Design a protein around this ligand. Structure first.
Ligand SMILES: Cc1cc2nc3c(=O)[nH]c(=O)nc-3n(C[C@H](O)[C@H](O)[C@H](O)COP(=O)(O)OP(=O)(O)OC[C@H]3O[C@@H](n4cnc5c(N)ncnc54)[C@H](O)[C@@H]3O)c2cc1C
Ligand SMILES: CCOc1ccc(CNc2nc3cc(C(F)(F)F)ccc3nc2C(=O)O)cc1
Ligand SMILES: C[C@H](CO)OC[C@@H](C)OC[C@@H](C)O
Length: 427
């Protein structure tokens, strides 16, 4: 309907597309039919809230279907723990709606501004990955509008399970998720009980994550230093916890356990001695979400290295700090077991997101990082990428051919297409 210039969150690789934006599900069905009618052409991609940094929710010279008007919560059930929602409902909306039922969104990323469609398509992960897996693990069914114009009901097992698992992490390339049922996590409060620790070095950070203590916490992540020289390199502030029960709340908060409330060298000493603490009761915002639009001069880079390749992980961190590219915003987490989605990002291992200001030599440097990540058995995350190559990506994802095989069965005429799909030869 409306021609619009589109970028991801990273404000990079702009491309103009025809954007459809309607709450009418049948207009969406018809729009897809029109693309298949004179198709494939440049095809169509779904788009949620545009929070992926890269080019997966854009389609230069083709159609983009903005899914955010499709935002109905159909039902929430405390007995079965199931929510039935349109793919355009966002996680903030869902979190608020589900709390009074004693239910918790089972996987929450670092912003609540993502759609359910976006969460499935990038198979997102959170602080609780090591205990809960990623978003795809909790989908009980979804309705997918496929290239033929049919809406397929998909489930994680049984008939069409292959297509379900291709859609999880599928970056919108199997079709348009219209609706889904998610199994929620039961909770008696909206609060976490948290332990904080501060480490002096990378070795001590790795030791903390390898000593077995991760088994005591359902939620775990850390900020880490990627700028100091060794041994300060890789020191971290670690925050770990679990959902609080009602009696763990200060008496004052007990009447309303499920309410979500409204949002130098001296700096280091404070951050360090007070960064260590035990059994601190924290609301969702303080434990997780300190909370606009993201700046334009930064490259987001996220990769995971297999748990066993720990020496190799230490080497990549060393390479980063000696590069003359400086990142202050650095997340670190140890992932748990992967799921069965062929293109799912998380594997067990050392997960890092760094944020580099765009300077001369950055592009070629991150290409060298790609090489290292690949060599050591790791991979990068599509939701954060706009610049890796088809060659590197296919090698990072050993089940890519399996996934492409599914994609071609469900979309032979390439009705579904994006800038990422062409760049990474997934089309
Ligand atoms: C500040 C910030 C913090 C973040 N933290 C995390 C984190 O902790 N963990 C993590 O895993 N990710 C994180 N992300 C990335 C984010 O979770 C993903 O990029 C997510 O997919 C974005 O959701 P969206 O609705 O904005 O989707 P978009 O960016 O609009 O789309 C992303 C992909 O989803 C597809 N898609 C969207 N809706 C549909 C649909 N209805 N049917 C089919 N396909 C669809 C699109 O085609 C596209 O391929 C973060 C991003 C930001 C900006
Ligand atoms: C200064 C802007 O404010 C913010 C807003 C959000 C954040 C946290 N963001 C993230 N947390 C993340 C947390 C994890 C996790 F799960 F904890 F390991 C993984 C990826 C993450 N990616 C981002 C991101 O920015 O892409 C940091 C700062
Ligand atoms: C997808 C990936 C191959 O690069 O496989 C993940 C391996 C390391 O982990 C196994 C799961 C069950 O924990």
């Amino acid at each position: 309907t409306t021609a619009t210039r589109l970028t991801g969150w990273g404000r990079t690789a702009p491309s103009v597309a025809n954007v459809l934006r309607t709450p009418d599900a049948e207009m969406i069905v018809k729009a897809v039919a029109r693309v298949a009618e004179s198709g494939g052409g440049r095809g169509a991609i779904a788009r949620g809230l545009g929070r992926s940094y890269g080019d997966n929710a854009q389609n230069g010279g083709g159609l983009v279907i903005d899914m955010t008007p499709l935002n109905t919560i159909h039902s929430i059930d405390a007995d079965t723990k199931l929510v039935d929602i349109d793919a355009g409902v966002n996680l903030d909306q869902l979190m608020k709606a589900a709390l009074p039922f004693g239910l918790w969104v089972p996987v929450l990323p670092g912003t609540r501004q993502v759609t359910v469609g976006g969460a499935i398509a990038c198979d997102i992960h959170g602080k609780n990955h090591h205990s809960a897996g990623s978003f795809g693990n909790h989908v009980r069914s979804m309705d997918l509008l496929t290239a033929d114009g049919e809406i397929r009901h998909l489930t994680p097992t049984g008939e069409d399970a292959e297509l379900f698992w291709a859609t999880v992490g599928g970056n919108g390339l199997t079709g348009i998720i219209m609706r889904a049922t998610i199994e929620m996590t039961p909770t008696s409060t909206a609060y976490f009980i948290a332990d904080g620790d501060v480490t002096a070095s990378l070795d001590e950070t790795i030791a903390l994550h390898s000593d077995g203590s991760e088994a005591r916490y359902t939620y775990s992540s850390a900020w880490f230093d990627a700028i100091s020289a060794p041994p300060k390199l890789g020191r971290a502030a670690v925050s770990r916890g679990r959902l609080a029960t009602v009696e763990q709340l200060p008496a004052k908060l007990r009447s309303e356990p499920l309410k979500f409330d409204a949002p130098g060298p001296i700096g280091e000493l404070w951050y360090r001695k007070s960064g260590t603490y035990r059994g601190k009761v924290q609301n969702l915002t303080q434990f997780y979400h300190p909370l606009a639009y993201g700046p334009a001069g930064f490259l987001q880079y996220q990769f995971v290295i297999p748990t066993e390749a720990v020496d190799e992980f230490k080497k990549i961190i060393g390479v980063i700090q000696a590069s003359g590219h400086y990142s202050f915003l650095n997340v670190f987490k140890l992932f748990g077991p992967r799921n069965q989605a062929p293109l799912s990002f998380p594997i067990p291992g050392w997960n890092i997101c760094v944020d580099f200001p765009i300077k001369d030599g950055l592009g070629k440097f991150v290409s060298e990082l790609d090489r290292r990540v690949l060599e050591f058995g790791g991979r990068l995350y599509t939701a954060k990428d706009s610049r890796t190559t088809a060659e590197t990506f296919h090698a990072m994802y050993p089940r890519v051919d399996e996934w492409i095989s599914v994609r071609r069965k469900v979309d032979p005429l390439r009705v579904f297409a994006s800038d990422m799909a062409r760049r990474l030869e997934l089309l």
